[PDB]
Symmetry: C2
């Protein structure tokens, strides 16, 4: 009253998307939320329009250096750096400031797993910003700390958790997830160039080396008592946004039981849409929305459960999750600023 | 060995037909006068010119499309039935039986009548030599054949990715394949779901959980290399590209990576179209577009006790028309690589 919000990493894709959502948030329109300092590690002194020409209402804002002093004096701070490490910065801010970290530093609950995959000391763990996971909403209500999930784990966990929690599939899961290129971030490399990406698909970081692998495992372990294993293969495709996760696991359960488990899990979840029978998700349908579209099936011959989930990697996969969780932290309606209606075609 | 081979293409106006024609135009036997391009036919559009369907094929743009009828297809030494999604048993029966008949469709691919009837809803017609020369035993069946059943595009990628590991008994026979495909694999019949505005910027799985008809075709090729009971979980995913398949293929394993790599070396070291990626490299469909190559890498996820094989092909070349031409070369006693480059057109 009013809630003054800073965004660190404002010039990146996640930062831009948080800002897009905040501009459309009812708390912004009625004055209860103010957009304050917009910061970046380089390009201080540049204007936001130079980075985000779609954000014309903020085009004139001058980007400031990312430092604790600049971020101080805000009620909420988004650390909009999904690929960055914000433990050092986060430690300099008050426990009473709401910090929403888009990065990985506070996602994991096992220090040994952290050290193995990230090669640094474990900073700790904050409430995980996936409100639909069992128990997660309770953790987020009134929190002043949020660790936003990775984009791929968001899709895979939404696809898989209801089946595993109901003990209807085996705990060895396979996930092959296609993703648009914005999930790779805004740092220019030759491999992310348009000419390279357009008209091509490639798997990367395969066979368990992708850092989101243990993150999927952690979310699944939380809903079962069994040893979880995850085979996760990400595939870059020629789209700017979207993740379509194809998730499989062996099953002994009939389709009717699995379908019922998903209906029960998601029937009162405003962002999670279970496809009518005979329809399947498409990433095009969710772009620009905070929705996840989910369908499930059983391959009887292969004794295999198949779950498909589509999300916008930048919305439900990143910035939408961040805002959704922010709403919960602040006691605002969870759906504020977050449409379920995709911008298609 | 063939010396004058006049070729017809039935279904010339579709993607497979256009690609066969592209390859024939670039074939050394075309340039030296041994391979001659005859009748080009389609079910509708007779009287139109080829350029109205395939503006890339300018040397043939003026050719007039003829009706797909046995009488028109007569007097050709080879006939490509270039309908990957069609059923050509009826037409094939009408051709002079000495003709080299190369069917891009499914009617002669499968070897189990009950499986055929289950997935295709008709009586099994039988089987012809499968046009995937790199599969164990396949090349021998193609030499001098007058009949070729061209493989489906997805089975091509999945079988190349998986067969060496399974043949060596180094992975479990329950396999998972999630394959991304450009939209040309769905064919050229105009539907809303295949419209540019729909496909651009979107990805979707389709025909999931064992309903896709390429599922039993993958199973069949795998059953040929093992005595174990094979199962296949196959999910195809359409992505916003015109061409390419990237198949991600997995199965449980407890075998060292080095033994798996040795199986791929054994299978592919003398196969000119199959490229095993250098260490630290992975396939990309961009690298094989417009080539007859498959690029393959393998890995082991130790924590998940899972083998991962990635295969990239151009769905229209190694997945369709290149397979057809490769098999044609074998049928006619011509060098297998004739007209078929391993070099992709990238970016």
């Amino acid at each position: 009253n009013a809630t003054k919000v800073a965004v660190a990493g404002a010039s990146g894709y996640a930062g831009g998307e948080i800002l897009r959502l905040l501009l459309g948030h009812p708390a912004y329109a009625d004055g209860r939320l103010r957009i304050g300092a917009l910061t970046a590690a380089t390009s201080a002194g540049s204007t936001l329009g130079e980075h985000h020409p779609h954000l014309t209402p903020l085009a004139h804002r001058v980007v400031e250096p990312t430092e604790a002093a600049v971020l101080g004096g805000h009620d909420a701070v988004f650390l909009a750096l999904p690929h960055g490490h914000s433990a050092v910065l986060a430690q300099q801010l008050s426990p009473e400031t709401l910090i929403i970290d888009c990065g990985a530093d506070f996602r994991l609950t096992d220090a040994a797993v952290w050290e193995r995959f990230y090669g640094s000391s474990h900073a700790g763990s904050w409430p995980y910003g996936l409100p639909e996971l069992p128990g997660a909403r309770d953790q987020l209500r009134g929190t002043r700390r949020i660790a936003v999930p990775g984009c791929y784990p968001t899709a895979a966990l939404l696809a898989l958790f209801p089946a595993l929690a109901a003990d209807l599939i085996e705990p060895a899961v396979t996930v092959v997830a296609v993703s648009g290129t914005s999930g790779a971030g805004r740092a220019a490399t030759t491999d992310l160039l348009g000419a390279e990406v357009i008209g091509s698909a490639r798997a990367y970081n395969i066979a368990g080396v992708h850092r989101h692998t243990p993150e999927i495992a952690q979310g699944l372990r939380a809903v079962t008592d069994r040893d979880v294993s995850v085979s996760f293969t990400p595939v870059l495709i020629p789209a700017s946004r979207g993740i379509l996760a194809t998730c499989t696991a062996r099953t002994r359960s009939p389709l009717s039981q699995l379908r019922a488990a998903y209906e029960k899990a998601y029937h009162a979840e405003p962002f999670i849409y279970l496809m009518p029978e005979g329809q399947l998700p498409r990433t095009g349908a969710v772009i620009g929305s905070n929705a996840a579209h989910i369908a499930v099936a059983v391959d009887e011959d292969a004794q295999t459960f198949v779950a498909i989930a589509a999300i916008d990697n930048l919305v439900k996969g990143t910035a939408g999750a961040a805002v959704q969780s922010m709403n919960l932290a602040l006691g605002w309606p969870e759906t504020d600023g977050l449409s379920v209606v995709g911008v298609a075609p």
